[PDB]
């Protein structure tokens, strides 16, 4: 709830000379403008003092922390660099499975890419911004051709930008890659500075924003799918899209790793980058690639495909961004368990989800959702609980804890804050009456319009569950889901913004596994 | 009705330099910042002058007390220190009943733990903050394994923090314990400073807050039950939860006394303390312990169990915090006696209750409630009245006296003030019409919403008795209780927020003992 | 959303001395008044520094770009000047096809008109304002007598004013010509300075306005049709019509190229130019030519004739300027495809069109409109896609991208901004309900009146498609189009402002080509 003007006037209180630089303001550090203040969160960070915290921490600091030490040097010491391997069969097998046929040993030395023998996996080190020891390791394993990502520490704390020590202060152009292998190929040929997102197209933590402040031109290259382009656009809004460019996906525009392997020239691809910022009026030139992609990716024109609800997939046909849907049904039918299952299935595919359930006792909700993840009854499997707990704490999944605050204004800024900090791509609220907290009809209409305004402006998909349909709700909402009863129930959809397809299908619910089936 | 800004400007009137320190502001004492002013009550207290009083007393002091002397030194002189006992059988029996097998004699000397021979009970002394003589003694007796608590003077005035002289000014970390024996074990192993609450998880008087101002990190450890965690959270709100941490209860997280006896490492338990302050958005990491506890303590998921209303227990299933319930019934059925019985039974289990009865002549109400405590007729037992009077004046039970004030705003701040000063966990108001004080319907709806807002924000359970049901009351309220007549009556519940269970059961009322039965 | 006063006060902030000159203010360049600031867009441009950008760029420039290099010198080197050709048959054939019988070799040397041998086409060079190398080439080819226009680079970026180096600073009179050959004849006889519009009567980019600031008297001569006169009037509003004059079309007032060839005196035509600015009251003197033209051009009294809807042409009889029409029909009839076809057919004749479609996913709309341009199915013709893409990116066609903005005020200024920047002569909005976002009826009436006010004031034709006719809409609107169903549909018109002709005709829609037929 702190605006940029409030940040500026607070700095003027201490008389600290600050310069408005892109996203995070730069000023001389009181504890050459090393001090950086986040525009939206006020999270301070110094390039020299290396101090981080909240805005309230900064306020208390002018009046009058972490080590992250883990047994990770052992893994580094027990792994051999790829370019220092005298073996012939081992290295040839290594590049074939990881697609490193065209990767030269010079790039390996520059990026310090290491290889581990016990599991035959790549090693991607994390270097401290201050030149200290290793901060973490990222491991990629090839299985069959599928790549498995494993990192130490947990992915929620993994904030490594590959090539950060390599890039210099005199560099203004940087290209971001969703993976790390494609970054090696991109730097090998173009030679321009490049960086990799921590968890790919999952999310971009704001802590990494100050490191990218120096660059003036930024080109996004995060895959070869419409989902990657949408993820790039969300990332663009954080970094003042007036200073960044995009590379549209296409048949002739593959990923940098495949482009070098396939022999296609990548300099032309980088040259045809289109601006991510547009005026209120645009021409067809900035849309030629998008229309071509939709013409050959009609399956990608919609959202992701659910792996547990084929019947829902054949009617809704996807889960887009910005669209708002409303779910409703009679009480006592467990309409709160289904939405947890619906969110969990989408969450398993790499979608950021946020839970703002009210009057549900979210502690109990976490238990129900975890049982759904286990696809069974966890009471009997209490012995094997740590294994599923570790698997549970790697998906993008977050919860909202409101103790006394219930106003509509309060929840909006917190939801907006959540999107900025963790790239929340999906928000679900269980009870809307608790937010309240002809008057009831008018109040219900007002809050629904606010959510529709928030969903459209922020492009984040929002799902509202209604506890007793409401007047004027259908016009504002894009989709409707009704779970009626006849533990057997059926879902009926009578409004589809994207497709205009309606229908109804039955469902079978089992309390043993808390998972619906048909 | 005095805000923090009003406190600050009043200090600026005299020009006293004050520093905003956590909860109670620190300033130089005019009668090194010894003077402390409470944020909510303004109760001044000096570390050197040792002067206490109300905010109005402070205002009158700048313009122009107690001794608490009791025959308690006799008990101390007639008791022998545990570490100075040459007997062998006596000391071995003493530790077995009190669970002091692993307690070393060095800890006994440090804490000056004494033992009394006539009744075989522990002695816990109270030391004055200024280094004066003893202020009180706390006695714990083991009977069968049950511990009985007896203190001199009365528990309402017992404000002793065990280990207060022991802790130094250069200590920033303190762990609070609900008992005293576990504090001895905690200090024996960890060696970190620790303190004990006066009456355990009952309440924390604000007078003890300035003594804890010096510490920056505070860890709560008040038992191994969900009730203890809830009590810790209420205590956290008083002491700026941004500077305190919590230890969640669990099977692998026992009390410090049992942890040392059981051999479990306690350093790990202290290391995994989770912050008591959270943002508006949280992840699953800060909820792993809570969901595990609810999975193995399903009986503790609800409130306490009544010892006198099994029929009410089988439907309501508990008495939670923050939930609001409304009681109603026809006049002349003695609906005011039942609520006194309902509060008294919960009060007997260690729950703070406040009475704001209007148009009931609370002096008469005290007589009725006391007769219910005696479980019979006190008219015949007038000879044995002092014994029950002493037993009556040790439960947490308080009353509200409103002579002329009837406005809704006035009662809200007084109720809020009562919670801050004595940890009021339950508020009951007999008559709502007296507070008033289509107009009547609108006024009744407004005040009910205010109570619901107050109950939810402060997490204090509030019960309203309605004197003739009301429109729009069911939606705002969480539970409904109706006492209809057919001195035989029956209670019907048609709304259960926590469980959704409804029913109706008869009751038999006897005027001889003023206690309902079935 | 920046007014002229805001521009003036911002300049006063830096203390830059600025002089209010006609359209674009003149001031001393900080990076003799070389700096020019656009009144409506603030697009800065310096005659010496040669720096261009947006108003926000100017704001950021005071705190603390393009090359357009193409292989065009090869074409110039491979072409021979017309006056340097020793051939006799070739030059005689060249002038007969291009109508250059009366053109003298002296004019060719002065304007540096070149001729290319491989395709037998004229060459019109583009010179940089700073005297640098060639910026572009315009090619005119004669085929049978029809002239084909081809320019390098794309017409959207062609901003060449023929004769700009030739005209001096001491010239106050300039005559604008829609073509280039007529400019050569006009300068040959009159000898007065003259310039040519980049794409003729299509549009006048604001970037060319500062170059015409020096001239005080401007005479428009853009053809011999009522459309040319209307286009001249729209151009007049941009350049303060108080300083410009018009030449009315007529039988005795042909184009300058034909006037010299036909032997008619052109000095008299230039002398009888009428002012383009009039008071609120006028006499018949300034209307004698207009009434004569309408008397002999009754076919030109209305708008253009559609080349794909003869049935619609026989009833509506044309597409005028300033008139507002409303289109409506039942959903699911593809009423959004027809309006794209209607706009595309008019766009193919040289009419600037703007798309502000809402809830249509304009990226998909571009695909549908492009398929209509191909007059068939592009899925099978994906191999021959670049050829149609190049043909698609030369018509005047623009789109509006609104992500979160939906207010009526926002869309009005953007539409007004679009007209100023690109001479938008046609605006079509697909969904009006999305702009919203008895109250609905009042809101719908208000926005329709705003569009009617905008259409009448700006003389731009606006078409609104209504998604369910509305009350009070017929009175404000000028024409109504209804597409009912009985994929066969029929269009009914029941209101014609210009003609008063009503009727209804059927239509046949084919999904293979997405083009209606009868």
UniProtKB/Swiss-Prot annotation, chains A, B, C:
Give the enzyme's main class according to its UniProt record, as a single word: isomerase
Q: Where does ATP bind?
A: 329-336
Effect after changing residue 371 to I: In MTDPS7; affects helicase activity
Membrane topology of this protein:
Peripheral membrane protein
Tissue expression as described in the entry: High relative levels in skeletal muscle, testis and pancreas. Lower levels of expression in the heart, brain, placenta, lung, liver, kidney, spleen, thymus, prostate, ovary, small intestine, colon and leukocytes. Expression is coregulated with MRPL43.
Q: Where are the transmembrane segments?
A: none
Q: What is its EC number?
A: 5.6.2.3
Q: Where is this region: Maybe required for stable oligomeric structure?
A: 319-484
Q: Does the keyword Transit peptide apply?
A: yes
Q: Which GO terms describe its cellular component?
A: mitochondrial chromosome; mitochondrial inner membrane; mitochondrial matrix; mitochondrial nucleoid; mitochondrion
Changing residue 274 to G does what? In MTDPS7; patients manifest multi-organ failure; requires 2 nucleotide substitutions
Q: What is the effect of changing residue 273 to T?
A: In PEOA3; reduces helicase activity
What changing residue 249 to L does, per the record, is: In PEOA3; displays unusual oligomeric forms
Where does the record place the region Primase-like domain?
133-249
Q: Which disease is it linked to?
A: Progressive external ophthalmoplegia with mitochondrial DNA deletions, autosomal dominant, 3: A disorder characterized by progressive weakness of ocular muscles and levator muscle of the upper eyelid. In a minority of cases, it is associated with skeletal myopathy, which predominantly involves axial or proximal muscles and which causes abnormal fatigability and even permanent muscle weakness. Ragged-red fibers and atrophy are found on muscle biopsy. A large proportion of chronic ophthalmoplegias are associated with other symptoms, leading to a multisystemic pattern of this disease.
Return the protein name: Twinkle mtDNA helicase
- Per UniProt, what is the name of the gene that codes for the protein in this document? TWNK
């Amino acid at each position: 709830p702190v605006t940029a003007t409030e940040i500026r006037q607070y700095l003027r209180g201490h008389g600290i000379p600050f310069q408005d630089g892109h996203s995070c303001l730069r000023a001389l550090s009181p504890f050459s403008f090393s001090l950086f203040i986040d525009k939206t969160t006020g999270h301070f960070l110094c390039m020299t003092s290396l101090a981080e915290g909240s805005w309230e921490d900064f306020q208390a600091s002018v009046e009058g922390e972490f080590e992250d030490s883990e047994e990770v040097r052992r893994i580094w010491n027990r792994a051999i660099p790829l370019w220092e391997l005298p073996d012939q069969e081992e290295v040839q097998l290594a590049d074939t499975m990881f697609g490193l046929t065209k990767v030269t040993d010079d790039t390996l030395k520059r990026f310090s890419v290491r290889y581990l023998r016990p599991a035959r996996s790549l090693v991607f080190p994390w270097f401290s911004p201050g030149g200290s020891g290793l901060r973490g390791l990222k491991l990629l394993e090839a299985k069959c051709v599928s790549y498995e990502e494993t990192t130490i520490p947990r992915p929620s704390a993994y904030h490594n930008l590959f090539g950060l020590p390599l890039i210099s202060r005199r560099d203004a152009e940087v290209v971001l890659t969703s993976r790390e292998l494609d970054s090696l190929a991109l730097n090998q040929s173009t030679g321009l500075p490049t960086l990799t997102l921590p968890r790919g197209t999952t999310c971009l933590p704001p802590a990494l924003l100050p490191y990218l402040e120096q660059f003036r031109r930024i080109v996004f290259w995060l895959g070869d799918d419409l989902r990657s382009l949408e993820a790039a656009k969300l990332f663009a809004r954080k970094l003042n899209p007036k200073r960044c460019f995009l590379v549209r996906p296409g048949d002739q525009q593959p990923r940098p790793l495949e482009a070098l392997n396939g022999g296609f020239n990548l300099s032309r691809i980088l040259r045809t980058a289109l601006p991510a910022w547009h005026k209120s009026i645009v021409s067809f030139r900035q849309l030629r690639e998008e229309v071509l992609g939709e013409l050959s990716n009609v399956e990608q024109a919609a959202g992701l495909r659910w792996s547990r609800f084929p019947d829902l997939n054949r009617i809704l046909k996807g889960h887009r961004k910005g669209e708002l849907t409303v779910f409703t049904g009679p009480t006592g039918s467990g309409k709160t368990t289904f939405i947890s299952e619906y969110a969990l299935d989408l969450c398993s595919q790499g979608v950021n989800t946020l839970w703002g359930s009210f009057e549900i006792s979210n502690v109990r909700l976490a238990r129900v959702m975890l049982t759904q993840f286990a696809e069974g009854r966890l009471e009997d499997q209490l012995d094997k609980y740590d294994h599923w707990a570790d698997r549970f704490e790697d998906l993008p999944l977050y919860f909202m804890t409101f103790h006394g605050q219930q106003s509509i204004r309060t929840v909006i800024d917190t939801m907006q804050h959540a999107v900025y900090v963790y790239d929340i791509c999906h928000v679900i609220i269980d009870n809307l009456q608790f937010m309240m907290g002809t008057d009831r009809i008018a109040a219900q209409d007002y809050i629904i319009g606010v959510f529709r305004k928030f969903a459209t402006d922020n492009n984040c998909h929002v799902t509202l569950v209604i506890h007793p349909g409401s007047a004027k709700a259908s016009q504002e909402a894009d989709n409707v889901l009704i779970l009626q009863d006849r533990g057997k129930r059926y879902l009926q959809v009578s409004k589809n913004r994207f497709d205009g397809d309606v229908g109804v299908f039955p469902l079978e619910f089992n309390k043993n596994s808390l998972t619906f089936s048909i």
